[PDB]
């Protein structure tokens, strides 16, 4: 579903949509030990040879780095090399592992190009839920 997000400065790209699945209500509640799929519709404002996906999670006003399995968006539905002005939507999927707490938080997402300028930047608050 298209989710509300706060743009933290998409300078090298234009977000067209952010589709997260499954997320019926927002902030979308993600039950522990369960995989979720992300779709990110964006319009690129620059040409970048490579693409590095960046994820930051903020708890209590403090950013936390979260490493993902894959650091490149071209093997996630992005055709490298990136050409200017083309519109591409990034598709991801990630599993929610156990042991994680049942919080609420803000996902921060950046996409740095060759010159290190974010092709898109959005932030979205999701709450870790239990069995439910």
């Amino acid at each position: 579903e298209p989710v509300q997000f706060k743009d933290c400065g998409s300078v090298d790209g234009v977000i067209k949509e952010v589709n997260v699945s499954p997320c019926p209500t927002q902030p979308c509640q993600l039950s522990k030990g369960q995989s979720y799929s992300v779709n990110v519709t964006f319009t690129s404002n620059i040409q970048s040879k490579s693409s590095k996906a960046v994820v930051h999670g903020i708890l209590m006003g403090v950013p936390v780095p979260f490493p993902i399995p894959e650091p490149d968006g071209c093997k996630s539905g992005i055709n490298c090399p990136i050409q200017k002005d083309k519109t591409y939507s990034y598709l991801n999927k990630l599993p929610v592992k156990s042991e994680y707490p049942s919080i609420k938080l803000v996902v921060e997402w950046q996409l740095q190009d060759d010159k290190n300028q974010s092709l898109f930047c959005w932030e979205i608050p999701v709450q870790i839920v239990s069995h439910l």
């Binding site: 706060k6 903020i58 209590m60 006003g61 707490p101 049942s102 919080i103 609420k104 803000v106 608050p125």
Partner: protein, 1175 residues
């Protein structure tokens, strides 16, 4: 043996320093941080220390323990073992016995290039029973601003699944960001690898760590606290067979009487099938002669009577008026009054209060969701941000008022009371906006990020309703909520409408202006009342459609009564008008004698005014309620006498040779013994009821007695002459009732069958009255003394409906206690070594009961706080070494040392002259953010110091709050039980005599102390009044004890039926109800006397004949005179405006009148016909 890994030279990042490796012997302490060794873990201090420890290691432990100290320091028993664990684990003297380093590497010195081998990792052998006893004994400590477990905040996860092994694992992991290096804990209970772990002694919640440190509370530990206390409620009703046990004793007695009665009558039907005369006779003749004299000397008589009226009523120049309620309702020498005199003298009077009960009707509750974790928290309507801003706006505006009195301006701050002044001078306002300090910025500012708030005003409110004495929220906001005046604001004092702990659910807002009350000073009180007046006007004119305000002021009750007192003189004037209207048409039957009825009204008013003026000379001040309730009564009696006299003349036919005076002397000589009996009986009744101890009833009783007497005298003297003059005068042209009574009423009433029924019915009604007697109320609502359209009524409704706290209580420990000795402190001491039956603990238990005792909260004793303050561990106190001056907790620390030496002996309480030595500094201590509350804002008032003679301590009090008190019964119960607690402590203290005693003081005690003896006061007062009536009656009527005893029995019946009607209309038995009854018992004679006199002085044949003859003759006069006139008066008074009149005077007078009418005109005829004295 020896220690390893000594010092800390490496560094990982930030401040984390890896301990340097050193496997030599432990290097004794550098003698520098003896204090650290003492404060951190004194188990090592028995000096040869040889401790492997380092002062920089101690101070880095101390630095790391900051937040764990803040959370787990609540229950010392737990934080004690946790400290026992770190200190030993780090620099214990047998450190090699329970430790083995694993990872270490060279540490290059940037100072010398010399490699030191840092201790990166090692294993720590911990007993299984130690981690189990530690986590399980401290794991119950709850967190602040929530009812969760503090482990929920220290595990890094819910305190619900942090295993006892996992939390320590998390603590030792450098993955948190706090541990400078990770330590691998080893939970082995047996020596392994020749290495045995260590677990020093541990203490559970069922034990205190030190002989001065109390065990953990049951607030933070579940095992210490067992079954709550409960008192046994005894109803003590007899309830013979299911009902009141009086409904039955009476119904049974009545049936027995009715059976012996129709069992005598029916049986009778079946069977059928110088010693006395010497003192009265001279009275009739004397009175005739004096009446004849006065009829032939009208000028002199009238002149002397006017001279009398003026000489007595000219004293109205000295008329006082008493309006202070204490003077009105309290005897000058009552026990409670003496207690108030002692309390007002040593601690100053209790303060004033201007409340304000705000409410938001147009809003619904909303939910607050804590961002990190937790359950939903609902907030009441009034806790809306918009409503909070508007209420803050109202409060800040209420603060601006500076009413000007006597060309001087007094600000609200100037009149309010500031405990800690002139350091802090703002003033006491007890509102939930003080949690935010009455600042829109403090109320508005949020500590969150987009699409969420991290911390918020609701969150801030949540933390300090839990701990109202903090100096910072200390929870992601770090803003205090202690209050601008300095001193806690207890949440139960500022809110109402919530459910027993859920200040989230509060529905009303409480706000208070305490104002200083002054002892022997009137200009300041005048100034305060002028400010309160302006406060009321403002609040009255404030619109704010979003709010429903209930307000009150200290001087408002007096204003309501002075307001209502004056809006019904129009009632007494209309009453007089109707009395005169009736008198004009009823006085005899241009056949009208109106000139004389007006003369009678003026004589009556003359008697009233004369009574007021004489007593003003005497010095009795006016209550303005009496000046309003007195005239009706006096008018009733005076008119009653006038009609008797005038009508005997109207019905008199002139003999053979009497001009005018001869006839009038003959009539007055035959009528005066009766009128005199009625007047003397009433004067004595009133005066004797003027023996009770209450200045309002005392003074009223005197006034009315004197007025009635003067009225009788002036009336017999001035009016017989003027009646003679009118009688000459009325004739030159310049009965129907008697027919009825004789014709159809007397004969009918005296038939042989109607008479037994009447007697039976009346004895039955008396039986009922005696049955429902002990169900009469005691006390006054305190809400009915106000008009109906008053805002104080709404305020009382609001109080009863919302407030959760009541009037403050002060348990004053009288002068004479020691306070400077172990035992002298133990008898009062609310602590550890002091008795378990100590004053503070006894008050605590009483508050734990809470219903069998109406004392709601803990004492908040000052001596416990003083000791907490003086303890070396707190370290708040600090004196100069040479000047012996108090070093504040915020001070450069140049050379000032701790008050109490930091040794095992110095920890103990200050028993000698040091107690006093340090006490004044405590009372002078301010609220330091590093120290705490300090002892100046709360106890400066509570402690008295006497200069010289060893500087012995003065009288002190321990103030606790009452429970919400709604009814008079509730107030009396509270008084009783406070006295009970004080009595217990006084008895337990075992004084070698009665040199001193504890006693409780509350504001309403002076007004409610009479109801602890009102029953015996009423008994005595009624019995004596009835005995006086009896004696006067058995004397004046001659000596025929039979007639007198009959009259007394009839009046006693009248009183009992008065009590029955009391119970039936819900009138209460206070001192006003009691005065009116003692009066009615004296007004009843007015009825019962004429008939009995007409019976006694009769010479017919049979008892029946005498009774009927008396009925016709006198009752024709008595029914038109006394009954109808009183009835018209009361029906006019039935429309009151003060509630007190309309309830008590109106109902009591209607009852007294109609009861006396029925009794006289019916039960006396029959009872006399039956059992009258033969002759």
């Amino acid at each position: 043996q020896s220690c390893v890994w000594y010092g800390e030279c490496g560094i990982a990042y930030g401040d984390k320093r890896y301990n340097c490796e050193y496997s030599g012997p432990p290097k004794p302490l550098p003698k520098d941080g003896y204090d650290l060794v003492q404060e951190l873990c004194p188990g090592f201090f028995f000096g040869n220390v040889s401790l492997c420890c380092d002062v920089r290691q101690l101070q880095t432990l101390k630095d790391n323990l900051q937040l764990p100290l803040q959370f787990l320091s609540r229950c010392p028993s737990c934080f004690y073992n946790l400290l026992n664990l770190f200190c030993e684990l780090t620099c214990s003297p047998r450190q090699s016995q329970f430790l083995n380093v694993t990872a270490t590497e060279d540490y290059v010195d940037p100072v010398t290039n010399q490699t030191k081998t840092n201790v990166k990792e090692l294993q720590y052998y911990v007993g299984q029973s130690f981690a189990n006893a530690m986590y399980n004994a401290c794991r119950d400590v709850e967190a602040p601003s929530s009812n969760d477990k503090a482990l929920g905040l220290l595990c890094g996860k819910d305190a619900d699944a942090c295993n006892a092994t996992n939390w320590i694992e998390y603590m030792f992991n450098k993955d948190n960001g706090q541990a400078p290096f990770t330590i691998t804990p080893v939970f082995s209970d047996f020596p392994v690898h020749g290495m045995e772990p260590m677990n020093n002694a541990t203490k559970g919640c069922d034990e205190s760590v030190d002989e001065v440190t109390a065990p953990c509370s049951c607030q933070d530990c579940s095992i210490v606290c067992g079954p709550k206390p409960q008192p046994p409620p005894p109803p003590a009703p007899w309830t013979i067979l299911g009902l009141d046990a009086m409904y039955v004793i009476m119904w049974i007695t009545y049936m027995a009487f009715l059976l012996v009665f129709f069992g005598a009558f029916f049986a009778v039907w079946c069977y059928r099938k110088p010693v006395s005369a010497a003192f009265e006779g001279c009275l009739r003749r004397l009175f005739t002669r004096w009446g004849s004299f006065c009829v032939r000397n009208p000028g002199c008589v009238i002149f002397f009577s006017l001279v009398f009226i003026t000489a007595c009523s000219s004293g109205l120049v000295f008329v006082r008026v008493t309006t202070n309620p204490v003077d009105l309702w309290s005897a000058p020498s009552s026990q409670a009054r003496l207690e108030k005199e002692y309390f007002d003298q040593h601690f100053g009077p209790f303060f004033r209060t201007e409340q304000l009960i705000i409410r938001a009707p147009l809003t619904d509750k909303h939910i607050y969701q804590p961002y990190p974790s937790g359950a939903d928290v609902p907030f009441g309507p009034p806790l809306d941000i918009q409503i909070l801003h508007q209420v803050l706006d109202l409060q800040i505006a209420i603060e601006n008022i500076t009413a000007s009195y006597d060309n001087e301006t007094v600000t609200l701050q100037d009149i309010c009371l500031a405990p800690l002044s002139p350091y802090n001078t703002n003033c006491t306002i007890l509102s939930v906006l003080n949690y935010f300090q009455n600042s829109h910025s403090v109320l508005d500012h949020k500590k969150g990020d987009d699409f969420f708030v991290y911390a918020d005003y609701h969150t801030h409110f949540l933390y300090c309703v839990r701990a109202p004495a903090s100096l910072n929220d200390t929870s992601l906001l770090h803003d205090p909520c202690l209050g601008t005046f300095g001193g806690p604001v207890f949440p139960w004092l500022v809110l109402g409408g919530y459910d027993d702990q859920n200040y989230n659910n509060a529905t009303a807002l409480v706000i208070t202006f305490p104002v200083n009350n002054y002892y022997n000073d009137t200009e300041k009180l005048q100034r305060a009342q002028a400010w309160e007046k302006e406060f009321i006007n403002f609040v009255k004119n404030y619109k704010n459609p979003n709010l429903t305000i209930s307000f009150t002021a200290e001087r408002s009750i007096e204003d309501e009564l002075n307001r209502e007192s004056d809006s019904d003189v129009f009632t007494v004037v209309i009453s007089y008008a109707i009395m005169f209207l009736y008198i004009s048409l009823a006085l005899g039957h241009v056949d009208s004698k109106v000139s004389l009825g007006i003369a009678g009204i003026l004589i009556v008013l003359s008697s009233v005014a004369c009574s007021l003026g004489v007593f003003s000379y005497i010095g009795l001040p006016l209550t303005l309620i009496v000046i309003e309730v007195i005239p009706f009564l006096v008018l009733a009696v005076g008119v009653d006498n006038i009609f008797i006299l005038v009508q005997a003349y109207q019905r008199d036919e002139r003999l053979q040779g009497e001009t005018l005076d001869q006839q009038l002397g003959r009539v007055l000589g035959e009528v005066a013994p009766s009128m005199f009996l009625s007047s003397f009986s009433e004067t004595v009744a009133f005066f004797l009821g003027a023996l009770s101890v209450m200045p309002a009833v005392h003074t009223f009783s005197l006034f009315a007695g004197l007025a009635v007497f003067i009225d009788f005298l002036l009336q017999i003297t001035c009016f017989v002459s003027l009646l003679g003059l009118d009688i000459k005068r009325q004739e030159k042209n310049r009965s129907c009732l008697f027919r009825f009574f004789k014709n159809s009423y007397s004969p009918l009433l005296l038939k042989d069958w109607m008479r037994p029924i009447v007697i039976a019915i009346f004895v039955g009604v008396l039986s009922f009255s005696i049955a429902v007697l002990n169900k009469v109320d005691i006390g006054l609502d305190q809400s009915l003394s106000m008009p109906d359209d008053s805002y104080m009524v709404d305020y009382f409704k609001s109080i009863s409906q919302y407030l959760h706290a009541g009037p403050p209580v002060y348990f004053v420990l009288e002068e004479g206690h020691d306070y400077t000795s172990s035992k002298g402190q133990n008898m009062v001491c609310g602590g550890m070594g002091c008795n378990n039956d100590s004053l503070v603990q006894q008050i605590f238990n009483a508050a734990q009961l809470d219903n069998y005792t109406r004392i709601g909260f803990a004492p908040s004793s000052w001596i416990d706080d003083y000791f907490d303050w003086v303890k070396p561990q707190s370290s708040c106190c600090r004196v100069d070494n040479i000047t012996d001056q108090f070093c504040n907790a915020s001070v450069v620390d140049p050379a000032c040392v701790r008050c109490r030496p930091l040794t095992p002996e110095g920890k103990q309480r200050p028993q000698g002259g040091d107690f006093m030595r340090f006490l004044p500094m405590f009372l002078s201590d301010n609220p330091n953010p590093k120290c705490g509350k300090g002892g100046h804002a709360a106890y400066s008032s509570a402690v008295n110091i006497l200069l010289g003679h060893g500087t012995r301590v003065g009288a002190t009090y321990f103030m606790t709050y009452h429970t919400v008190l709604q009814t008079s019964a509730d107030f009396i119960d509270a008084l009783k039980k406070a006295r009970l607690i004080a009595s217990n402590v006084t008895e337990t203290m075992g004084i070698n005599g009665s040199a001193y005693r504890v006693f409780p003081y509350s504001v309403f005690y002076v007004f409610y102390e009479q109801y602890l003896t009102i029953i015996d006061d009423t008994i005595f007062n009624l019995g004596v009044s009835l005995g006086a009536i009896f004696l006067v009656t058995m004397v004046l009527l001659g000596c025929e004890l039979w007639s007198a005893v009959i009259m007394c029995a009839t009046i006693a019946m009248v009183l009992v039926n008065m009590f029955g009607v009391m119970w039936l209309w819900g009138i209460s038995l206070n001192a006003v109800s009691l005065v009116n009854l003692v009066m009615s018992c004296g007004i009843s004679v007015e009825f019962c006397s004429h008939i009995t006199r007409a019976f006694t002085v009769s010479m017919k044949g049979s008892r029946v004949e005498r009774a009927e003859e008396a009925l016709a003759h006198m009752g024709s006069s008595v029914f038109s005179g006394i009954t109808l006139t009183k009835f018209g008066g009361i029906v006019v008074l039935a429309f009151a405006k003060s509630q007190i009149f309309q309830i008590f005077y109106f109902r009591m007078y209607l009852a007294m009148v109609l009861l006396g009418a029925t009794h006289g005109l019916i039960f006396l005829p029959v009872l006399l016909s039956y059992i009258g004295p033969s002759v």
